[PDB]
From a paper:
[name] has 35 genes assorted in functional groups or modules, among them, a gene coding for an antirestriction protein called [name]. Interestingly, [name] contains an N-terminal [name] binding domain and a C-terminal metalloprotease domain. [name] is structurally similar to DNA-binding dependent metalloproteases involved in the maintenance of genetic stability such as Spartan or IrrE. In summary, our results indicate a new mechanism of DNA antirestriction played by protein [name], by which plasmids increase their conjugation host range.
[name] [name] crystal structure was solved at 2.6 Å resolution using a selenomethionine-derivative protein structure solved by single anomalous dispersion as described in Materials and Methods. Apo [name] crystallized in the H3 space group containing one molecule per asymmetric unit. [name] is composed of two structural domains: An N-terminal domain (residues 1–134) and a C-terminal domain (residues 151–297) joined by a long and flexible loop (135–150). Electron density was not observed for the N-terminal residues 1–6, the flexible small loop residues 33–39, residues 136–141 in the region connecting both domains and C-terminal residues 294–297. The N-terminal domain is composed of three α-helices (α1-α3), a three-stranded β-sheet (β1, β3, and β4) that supports a long and protuberant β-hairpin (β3-β4), a smaller two-stranded antiparallel β-sheet formed by β2 and β5, as well as three 310 helices labeled from η1 to η3. The surface electrostatic map reveals a positively charged groove in the region of the N-terminal domain adjacent to the C-terminal domain, suggesting a DNA binding site between both structural domains. The surface electrostatic map revealed a negatively charged catalytic pocket.
Residue numbers in the entry: 7 to 32, 40 to 135, 142 to 293
Amino acid sequence: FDLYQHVTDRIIASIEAGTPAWRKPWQMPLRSNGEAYRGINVVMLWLTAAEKGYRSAYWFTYRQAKELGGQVRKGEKGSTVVKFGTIEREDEQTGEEKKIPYLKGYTVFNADQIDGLPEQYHARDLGTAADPELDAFFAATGADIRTSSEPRAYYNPTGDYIHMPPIATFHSAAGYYATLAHEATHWTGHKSRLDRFSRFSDRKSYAFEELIAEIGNCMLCASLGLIPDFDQSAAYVQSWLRALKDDKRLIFKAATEAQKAADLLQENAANFQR
């Protein structure tokens, strides 16, 4: 079937239900080798886990479960994850090789659906003051963070800095750092970094940047042990629905861009290099 439309339809339904897929955790989903899923697969597996009530982070193909001594239980239904790539094909008239880009599906099962797996496969309280570890992380991203009494958090792309209100006015360090995480996600879109604002001139006012930032903030908060704030997104949800109904590929681009934003903050903070 149409993988693009199948995923987009699942997302549209979760939004119309009142709980968008990427909000469901409120636990990164992992492959059988322990590596995290990425991009649109994170969103799909969060949704499935919530829909079906799974608690394990791990997802297996039937074969991967078999190789580990596990058996998918009778009657259990798998879940779709997608892979993009290129594959070698030939012209036909000529034999010229031409790598073709493709989208394909895989079926995976949560560890909770499987008997016999090794046992390995079966939030920090921050109070109201600054946290040394989270302060160190955000400093290491490279973001210029400025503070004033203005009671609004935002990323200023022209001066290229994040404005935060004072932490004491949140009466919750968790709320402070979740808010900073959200603005740091926007901060990755600057022309000198991921360059989202010029690449996605959003003429049909799909609120595409806010969708990327919300998904990217969920990914970043998942990895930081924080709880994202969703209350500042009611104004965009209708445009997101409109966008998804118009373009069955859009949520894939948004999830990929979201993943790139979360990647860049974590790479900067680890002094990642090639």
